[PDB]
Amino acid sequence: SFSFGGFTFKRTSGSSVKKEEEVLTGNLQTLKIRVHEGYEEFTMVGRRATAILRKATRRLIQLIVSGRDEQSIAEAIIVAMVFSQEDCMIKAVRGDLNFGSGLNPMHQLLRHFQKDAKVLFQNWGIESIDNVMGMIGILPDMTPSTEMSLRGIRVSK
């Protein structure tokens, strides 16, 4: 169990080791980040939202988020997208990432997208979805949809 972005993450299956890696942001800043390598499954519980997360090396496999309102659901999605370490998120950064107490690089990334996530969501990718009991899609602009969704993401009740 650990905490990230105001969410408690508890690992329900799988595992990971960490390898340092250099990466190039969409503002062309180089960062050394600790990459988690492994298939892992988690629950996330924040103050206003809950989720199930399955991921692998720099890849979000599935996120099912349950939340109180649009605002809360969004915050959960942003934390799980940054936590995924996917390169479309790395490449969505605009402006430099300063400092820093307080802030290893994953937190810097998070603080950046928490100030504004529009570009993160635009660039993530969408997919058509099927009908699944208790599950609905969320579009890049955060409105609901039965036909499409942000890739890997679904909203529960």
Side-chain angles (χ1 to χ4, degrees), residues 122-135:
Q122 179 192 203
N123 282 312
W124 182 263
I126 64 235
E127 48 186 19
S128 65
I129 74 188
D130 292 351
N131 294 344
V132 182
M133 39 294 176
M135 268 193 250

Side-chain angles (χ1 to χ4, degrees), residues 59-76:
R59 187 196 296 281
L60 188 156
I61 294 332
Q62 183 187 42
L63 183 78
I64 306 155
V65 39
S66 315
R68 226 189 38 188
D69 48 35
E70 161 174 321
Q71 188 145 308
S72 296
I73 283 156
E75 294 159 7

